[PDB]
Motif scaffolding. Structure first.
Motif, mmCIF file in Angstrom:
data_model
loop_
_atom_site.group_PDB
_atom_site.id
_atom_site.type_symbol
_atom_site.label_atom_id
_atom_site.label_comp_id
_atom_site.label_asym_id
_atom_site.label_seq_id
_atom_site.Cartn_x
_atom_site.Cartn_y
_atom_site.Cartn_z
ATOM 1 N N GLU A 25 0.802 -1.224 0.000
ATOM 2 C CA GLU A 25 0.000 0.000 0.000
ATOM 3 C C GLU A 25 0.838 1.279 0.000
ATOM 4 O O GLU A 25 0.323 2.360 0.279
ATOM 5 C CB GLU A 25 -1.101 -0.013 1.072
ATOM 6 C CG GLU A 25 -0.578 0.035 2.509
ATOM 7 C CD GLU A 25 -1.688 0.282 3.531
ATOM 8 O OE1 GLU A 25 -2.852 0.459 3.111
ATOM 9 O OE2 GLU A 25 -1.355 0.298 4.740
ATOM 10 N N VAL A 71 -15.289 11.429 3.730
ATOM 11 C CA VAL A 71 -14.835 10.086 4.083
ATOM 12 C C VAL A 71 -13.466 10.049 4.767
ATOM 13 O O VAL A 71 -12.523 10.713 4.342
ATOM 14 C CB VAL A 71 -14.884 9.182 2.839
ATOM 15 C CG1 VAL A 71 -13.829 9.569 1.803
ATOM 16 C CG2 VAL A 71 -14.655 7.720 3.220
ATOM 17 N N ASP A 126 -12.748 6.707 6.299
ATOM 18 C CA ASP A 126 -12.713 5.268 6.533
ATOM 19 C C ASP A 126 -11.474 4.545 6.000
ATOM 20 O O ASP A 126 -11.395 3.320 6.077
ATOM 21 C CB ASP A 126 -14.016 4.616 6.056
ATOM 22 C CG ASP A 126 -15.219 4.968 6.931
ATOM 23 O OD1 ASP A 126 -15.040 5.708 7.922
ATOM 24 O OD2 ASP A 126 -16.324 4.488 6.594
ATOM 25 N N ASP A 127 -10.505 5.288 5.458
ATOM 26 C CA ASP A 127 -9.302 4.718 4.864
ATOM 27 C C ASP A 127 -9.541 3.727 3.722
ATOM 28 O O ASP A 127 -8.661 2.950 3.361
ATOM 29 C CB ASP A 127 -8.316 4.228 5.930
ATOM 30 C CG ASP A 127 -7.631 5.369 6.686
ATOM 31 O OD1 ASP A 127 -6.865 5.047 7.620
ATOM 32 O OD2 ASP A 127 -7.869 6.548 6.331
ATOM 33 N N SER A 128 -10.748 3.758 3.150
ATOM 34 C CA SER A 128 -11.145 2.849 2.087
ATOM 35 C C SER A 128 -10.403 3.139 0.777
ATOM 36 O O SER A 128 -10.394 2.299 -0.120
ATOM 37 C CB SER A 128 -12.662 2.963 1.901
ATOM 38 O OG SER A 128 -13.101 2.134 0.846
ATOM 39 N N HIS A 157 -12.356 -6.883 0.600
ATOM 40 C CA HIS A 157 -11.622 -6.376 1.746
ATOM 41 C C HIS A 157 -10.326 -7.152 1.975
ATOM 42 O O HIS A 157 -10.145 -8.255 1.463
ATOM 43 C CB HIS A 157 -12.518 -6.454 2.984
ATOM 44 C CG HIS A 157 -13.777 -5.630 2.879
ATOM 45 N ND1 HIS A 157 -14.910 -5.781 3.660
ATOM 46 C CD2 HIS A 157 -14.013 -4.609 1.999
ATOM 47 C CE1 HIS A 157 -15.814 -4.865 3.261
ATOM 48 N NE2 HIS A 157 -15.286 -4.144 2.253
ATOM 49 N N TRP A 161 -13.989 0.414 -5.370
ATOM 50 C CA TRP A 161 -13.936 1.252 -4.182
ATOM 51 C C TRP A 161 -15.300 1.273 -3.504
ATOM 52 O O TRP A 161 -16.311 1.575 -4.136
ATOM 53 C CB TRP A 161 -13.487 2.666 -4.558
ATOM 54 C CG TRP A 161 -13.273 3.605 -3.409
ATOM 55 C CD1 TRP A 161 -13.167 3.250 -2.109
ATOM 56 C CD2 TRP A 161 -13.113 5.060 -3.431
ATOM 57 N NE1 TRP A 161 -12.973 4.370 -1.329
ATOM 58 C CE2 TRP A 161 -12.936 5.515 -2.093
ATOM 59 C CE3 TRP A 161 -13.092 6.037 -4.442
ATOM 60 C CZ2 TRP A 161 -12.773 6.867 -1.767
ATOM 61 C CZ3 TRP A 161 -12.913 7.395 -4.130
ATOM 62 C CH2 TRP A 161 -12.751 7.808 -2.798
ATOM 63 N N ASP A 162 -15.329 0.955 -2.209
ATOM 64 C CA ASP A 162 -16.559 0.923 -1.438
ATOM 65 C C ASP A 162 -17.227 2.270 -1.197
ATOM 66 O O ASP A 162 -18.445 2.384 -1.325
ATOM 67 C CB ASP A 162 -16.334 0.205 -0.109
ATOM 68 C CG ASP A 162 -16.283 -1.316 -0.235
ATOM 69 O OD1 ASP A 162 -16.130 -1.963 0.826
ATOM 70 O OD2 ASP A 162 -16.394 -1.827 -1.373
ATOM 71 N N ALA A 163 -16.440 3.290 -0.847
ATOM 72 C CA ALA A 163 -17.000 4.591 -0.510
ATOM 73 C C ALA A 163 -17.674 5.229 -1.727
ATOM 74 O O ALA A 163 -18.587 6.036 -1.571
ATOM 75 C CB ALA A 163 -15.894 5.483 0.043
ATOM 76 N N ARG A 206 -18.214 -8.836 0.008
ATOM 77 C CA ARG A 206 -17.311 -8.257 0.999
ATOM 78 C C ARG A 206 -15.890 -8.812 0.901
ATOM 79 O O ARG A 206 -14.998 -8.324 1.588
ATOM 80 C CB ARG A 206 -17.876 -8.462 2.412
ATOM 81 C CG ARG A 206 -17.760 -9.896 2.948
ATOM 82 C CD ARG A 206 -18.572 -10.920 2.152
ATOM 83 N NE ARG A 206 -18.514 -12.241 2.786
ATOM 84 C CZ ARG A 206 -19.416 -12.704 3.656
ATOM 85 N NH1 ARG A 206 -20.455 -11.962 4.033
ATOM 86 N NH2 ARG A 206 -19.275 -13.928 4.155
ATOM 87 N N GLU A 266 -4.440 8.801 -3.033
ATOM 88 C CA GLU A 266 -5.388 8.686 -1.934
ATOM 89 C C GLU A 266 -6.157 9.984 -1.711
ATOM 90 O O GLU A 266 -7.378 9.959 -1.583
ATOM 91 C CB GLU A 266 -4.619 8.282 -0.670
ATOM 92 C CG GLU A 266 -5.467 8.428 0.601
ATOM 93 C CD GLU A 266 -4.647 8.183 1.868
ATOM 94 O OE1 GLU A 266 -5.169 8.501 2.958
ATOM 95 O OE2 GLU A 266 -3.507 7.682 1.747
#
Length: 156
Positions: A12, A105, A107-109, A153, A47-49, A150, A90
């Motif tokens: 990352e 946001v 949430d570090d997503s 993740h 990406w979730d967000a 999910r 990011e």
């Protein structure tokens, strides 16, 4: 986890840069340049967000069209700089959806998403295309029926 294991990314913190004097990360070949834009597009879709922002409509009814610009500004880093990393991507992901969804946001997503954009450049460099090819098929079911899971993740 109690021990180290493989994951969806390098660490990352991976990045990519010009070969020696290219002045840009844009490729010298039309195949490497075009497949790079497709690969970055598929990373914004995991990406979730962003996925919940278009589904809960945190913005206007054009929320399904705003997600097409989030990949454009990420590719714009590769044609205006001689190096890009998962760290400046990011904040670009966060600030772009804040300007269209006001999510703020935290949430570090976007961390695993920012490094996934870095992987597209290296997949376009060896002509193996393994990551841009597979995500383009796994994406067709995300829009024809809004399927989700999910398992995207980290293994924790």
């Amino acid at each position: 986890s109690g021990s180290h294991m493989s994951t969806q990314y390098i660490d990352e913190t991976a990045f990519v840069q010009a070969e020696q004097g290219k002045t840009n990360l844009m490729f010298s070949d039309e195949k490497q340049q075009a497949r790079f834009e497709l690969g970055v597009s598929m990373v914004i879709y995991k990406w979730d967000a962003l996925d919940v922002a278009v589904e809960n409509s945190w913005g206007g009814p054009d929320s399904a069209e705003k997600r097409d610009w989030i990949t454009g500004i990420v590719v714009d880093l590769f044609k205006n700089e001689k190096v890009v990393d998962a760290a400046l991507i990011e904040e670009t992901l966060l600030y772009a959806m804040i300007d269209e969804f006001e999510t703020n946001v935290e949430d570090d997503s976007a961390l695993p998403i920012a490094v996934e954009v870095i992987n597209i450049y290296n997949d376009c460099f060896n002509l193996n295309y393994n990551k841009v090819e597979k995500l383009y098929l796994e994406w067709q079911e995300k829009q024809r029926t809004k399927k989700s899971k999910r398992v995207v993740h980290i293994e924790g």
